[PDB]
Symmetry: C2
Subunit: 218 residues, 2 copies
Amino acid sequence: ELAKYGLPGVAQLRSRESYVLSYDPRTRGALWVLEQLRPERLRGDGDRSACDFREDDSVHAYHRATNADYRGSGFDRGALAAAANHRWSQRAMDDTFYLSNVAPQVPHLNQNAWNNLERYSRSLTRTYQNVYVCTGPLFLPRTEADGKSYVKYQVIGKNHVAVPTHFFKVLILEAAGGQIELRSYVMPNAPVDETIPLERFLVPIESIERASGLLFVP
Amino acid sequence: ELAKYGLPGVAQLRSRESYVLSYDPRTRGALWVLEQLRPERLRGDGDRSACDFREDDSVHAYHRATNADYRGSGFDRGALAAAANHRWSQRAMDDTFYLSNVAPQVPHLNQNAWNNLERYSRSLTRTYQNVYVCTGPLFLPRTEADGKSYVKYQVIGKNHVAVPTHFFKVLILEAAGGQIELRSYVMPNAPVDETIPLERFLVPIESIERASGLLFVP
Ligand SMILES: [Mg+2]
Ligand SMILES: [Mg+2]
């Protein structure tokens, strides 16, 4: 048999209380995380200190981000499935502090501009019955003086956790009616101004689908 | 439950007559390719023109490598599963010319030193009843002027096909008496001296396992 000893590659799905993620052991962070925020269900009892992030013991130690990797890095532990999205229940929001839900994020971006869009998705849960949000990183290519195009991203910690160049957020908004409503955003991993209107970052989703390796048109 | 709209990330395993691969839609290349070389049966009468490659149709057109991506790159279409490994059957060799089995490779490496390593793998079908080979790319970080580590690789064509910085090859040498011995090689995607003994590119498998995100030890 060709599979006599096992295949080296894992399809690394995780389904937590609060989201589903697909994990990439090479980047030491998630490919995508999808949550369904419904209203009804956002605001609730439960909280946790802003810094109580935990490594994921379901990920092999070879490919597992640790708090030490972020230590001294200048990057926030930016959660993709946001914490205030799941104040519904306690470990429903404890699952959002696993480092599998986290990518190195420029702190000004984590606290102001990505934060405003997190609010926007939390505001749009108001016009539509159900709001599904899928979030993840981008590593976008970039030319230099020689004319050739390069992907270049920073790598932090001894475990070499990748710092994304960009992040995407795609929302498909509905149950209560007829169900069109797809909206796609991308911001660079950089101190982007809070003043810029949120929709200056709208992008067609195949932009994201080609770059990310994922397919969203279902 | 939130999976009501499927998942955007499909794990990608193809099984051809000659190998199992696992595909990466973001790099537009295989994460690994798994062959089982057996002492002679896989050297028969098959043959194929050396540049006759097919773009894979089992991969969505947003994430697939094409021959136009390679055309002006300066890079060889280096087959990870070697074509000479499967003279056994015409289809077993035609499978190795799928572009999903191919990564951008510096042509001097493809034809002198990587070639010697594959000729070395085919050789060791002397001593061992079975020789398993797993080949794949590596994207290794390098340290820059500012003291930070970055992963930097070129992308070619307008599907942005990742140019690996290194290549790994793992030999699982099954001796006739059941005994299995392990061997691991990493060579840079560069013109490297074919006169250097292949012994100098030996590396520990945990090193490939931490860099690639794969787990090999059976
Ligand atoms: Mg945050
Ligand atoms: Mg070759």
